[PDB]
Design a binder for this molecule. Structure first.
Ligand code: HEM
Ligand SMILES: O=C(NC1CC1)C1CCN(c2cnccc2-c2ccccc2)CC1
Length: 434
């Protein structure tokens, strides 16, 4: 009854249903999500008001499935899932040092070496006939980049190593999904314990290295440790280990996979991207940091890919006091749902919204004003945004330099939702050298 007055109903995902309801019922609509009543707010005025203010905190009820799954602590109170402002702010300020401009410039060697490894593996299969899962190959690349860049760890998933780790990540993502019988419970719980035990093993290795006075370059793990200096126990440390182990590869992989999928049906845009990489980097194996800013059309293509295919569709804020939102009375203690997926597909905000058009992000084009937020906005925006944008530009630039991709017929463009949105199909392609 407390929500009955709010407007609403009486390879598809629930976000497509929400899109249909926002179009039909307007900027404030009641929905059921993760078995709670929520209100989806899709005006840009609401996005600005609620996301650009430290007055509005995340609604912790809507993060339970990242905190704990089936009674196993997962991300716990790490940086994504901590919804207390002061507890979040303390860790954010310490971990931010690992995402400074100087920190990220130092990661270009890791980005280049893993991108070069992927392209060499793909070139050996570029016979126009062997089907390759670009979803799988881009996930292995993203995991290898993250493990090296964040932790100084070589996972070598691109060599076929760490299969139990790859399986554990897959079942943990299925667990998040199922949360929000007997064998699936056992497999999910053991996978979460395995990921935390990877953290314990790697933190002990880092501590022993530091004790023996071995050289350890400052990385994300350095700052994760710094945030816990004088903690009562290692459970905060492991919460952020697992948070960054998962967060630092999965959305990047999703975004790469979506971009390759969509580009397979955009031959003219691919010819333009191939030309731009030819003009900017030439034959050079290695992209320098200053080359990234020169790949302007690729930047636009990746922004348009996130408009239609945001791996992280949005966020929630807790409305504490009854508030009028776009002419609608919204009760206190309500989860407000913000969706860049829904707003990206509304003709109100984007003309011909299903058309893939990188020129929407061109230099003279008007910037979306609070209608586009694939890294969210405000104080709780993605800490990894610049990390992600650099690594994906390096991977995509190296693929475009060296290879041609054709999507295998029968492969779909639809979505699935696990913890994030990702292609329904494996993005199975045949390849040829340029
Ligand atoms: C294309 C890639 C990526 C996308 C689309 C993405 C998207 C997002 C979004 C929408 C949020 C806000 C989530 C919320 O409000 O609940 C977020 C937060 C976060 N992301 Fe990402 N992300 C990406 C890459 C990364 C990477 C590479 C890392 C780490 C290296 C990372 C770590 C995080 C963390 C730790 C947070 C929580 C930040 C905070 O609240 O202070 N993300 N991301
Ligand atoms: O569960 C979430 N929000 C709850 C309201 C429902 C999102 C929180 C932000 N997440 C990320 C953000 N940056 C990078 C990666 C992830 C990521 C990917 C895989 C698994 C976990 C997290 C995406 C999920």
């Amino acid at each position: 009854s407390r929500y009955e007055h709010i407007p609403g109903p009486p390879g598809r995902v629930l976000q497509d249903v929400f899109l249909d309801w926002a179009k039909k019922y307007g900027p404030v609509v009641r929905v059921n999500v993760f078995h709670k009543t929520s209100v989806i707010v899709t005006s840009p005025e609401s996005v600005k008001k609620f996301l650009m203010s430290t007055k509005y905190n995340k609604d912790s009820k809507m993060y339970r499935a990242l905190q704990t799954v089936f009674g196993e602590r997962l991300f716990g109170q790490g940086l994504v899932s901590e919804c207390n402002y002061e507890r979040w702010h303390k860790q954010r300020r310490v971990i931010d040092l690992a995402f400074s401009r100087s920190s990220l410039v130092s990661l270009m060697e890791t980005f280049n070496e893993k991108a070069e490894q992927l392209v060499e593996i793909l070139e050996a299969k570029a016979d126009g006939q062997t089907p390759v899962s670009m979803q799988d190959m881009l996930t292995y690349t993203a995991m290898d980049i993250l493990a090296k860049a964040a932790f100084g760890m070589e996972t070598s998933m691109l060599l076929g190593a760490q299969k139990p780790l790859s399986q554990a990540v897959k079942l943990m993502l299925e667990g998040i999904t199922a949360s929000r019988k007997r064998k699936q419970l056992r497999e999910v719980r053991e996978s979460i314990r395995f990921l935390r035990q990877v953290g314990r093993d790697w933190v002990q290795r880092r501590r022993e290295a530091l004790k023996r006075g071995e050289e350890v370059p400052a990385d994300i793990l350095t700052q994760i440790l710094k945030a816990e200096e004088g903690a009562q126990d290692d459970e905060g440390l492991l919460d952020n280990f697992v948070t960054f182990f998962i967060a630092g590869h999965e959305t990047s992989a999703n975004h790469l996979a979506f971009t390759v999928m969509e580009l397979s049906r955009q031959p003219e845009i691919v010819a333009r991207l191939q030309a731009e990489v030819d003009e900017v980097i030439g034959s050079k194996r290695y992209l320098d940091f200053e080359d990234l800013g020169r790949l302007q059309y690729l930047s636009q293509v990746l922004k348009e890919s996130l408009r239609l295919y945001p791996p992280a569709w949005g966020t929630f804020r807790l409305l504490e006091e009854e508030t009028l939102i776009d002419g609608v009375r919204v009760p206190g203690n309500t989860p407000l749902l913000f969706s860049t997926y829904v707003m990206g597909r509304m003709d109100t905000y984007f003309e011909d919204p299903l058309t893939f058009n990188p020129d929407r992000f061109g230099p003279g084009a008007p910037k979306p004003r609070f209608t586009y937020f694939p890294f969210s906005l405000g104080h709780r925006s993605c800490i990894g945004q610049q990390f992600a944008q650099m690594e994906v530009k390096v991977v995509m630039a190296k693929l475009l330099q060296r290879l041609e991709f054709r999507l295998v017929p029968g492969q779909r463009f639809g979505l699935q939702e696990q913890a994030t949105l990702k292609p329904l199909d494996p993005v199975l392609c045949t390849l040829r050298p340029r």
